[PDB]
Amino acid sequence: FSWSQRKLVTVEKQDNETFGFEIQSYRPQNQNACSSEMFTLICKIQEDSPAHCAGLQAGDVLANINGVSTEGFTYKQVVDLIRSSGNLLTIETL
Amino acid sequence: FSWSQRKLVTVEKQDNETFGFEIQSYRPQNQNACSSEMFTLICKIQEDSPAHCAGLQAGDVLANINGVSTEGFTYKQVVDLIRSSGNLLTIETL
């Protein structure tokens, strides 16, 4: 893997806006020397949006949300958890 | 997407060794604001190997091989094409 600036960021936002990013679950179609299973990535970042301001970048890999390890997570769990966070969000990426 | 140093690299190797990298096809389980379908990434790079020397990095996204656009490519096509290249390989990544 050895890539993407490991960051620990915390984003806050206005009650009726989005944090400003888009995620994407990706499944590996290939057993081999690496490793299989689910992984979610930020795919789009709104310029000026809070996620941008927090220092988040498209390509960042979501490993921890609000102290919650995200592996094995389906896209919807990741989304449900993020909505479970109101206007506050803490993220440890990759 | 906006990420990963767009590079145009060309790797050569010894007849009985590997270029030194590992790929991985990833499928998106999520229709939304971004974009669906196949995409292959280098997942592992052997230290000192030719791919390393060429300047290839794990995370690099294979878009063109020997002048061949790779989208819609199944993991095996990417592998078959790479083997179709003998000890020479040209790669435009992302």
Nearest to B94 by CA among B58, B55, B50, B60: B60
Q: What distance in Å separates the CA atoms of residue B17 and residue A65, rounded to the nearest whole number? A: 42
CATH code for the domain in which residue A77 is found? 2.30.42.10
After which residues does chain A show a gap where C to N exceeds 2.5 Å?
Answer: none
Residue B45: give the domain boundaries.
1-94
Nearest by CB to B25, from A1, A30, A57: name it: A30
Residues of A in contact with B94 (CB under 8 A): none
Backbone φ and ψ for A84, nearest 5 degrees, come out as -70, -10
Resolution of this model in Å is 2.7
Number of separate domains in chain B:
1
Q: In the numeric block, which tokens belong to residue A78?
A: 């990741």
Method: X-ray
Nearest to B2 by CA among A9, A46, A59, A55: A59
Query: Measured between alpha carbons, how far is B78 from B61 in angstroms, rounded to an integer?
Result: 12
Q: Using the beta-carbon criterion (under 8 Å), do B27 and A27 form an inter-chain contact?
A: yes
**Helices (H), ranges, B1-94:** 50-54, 75-84
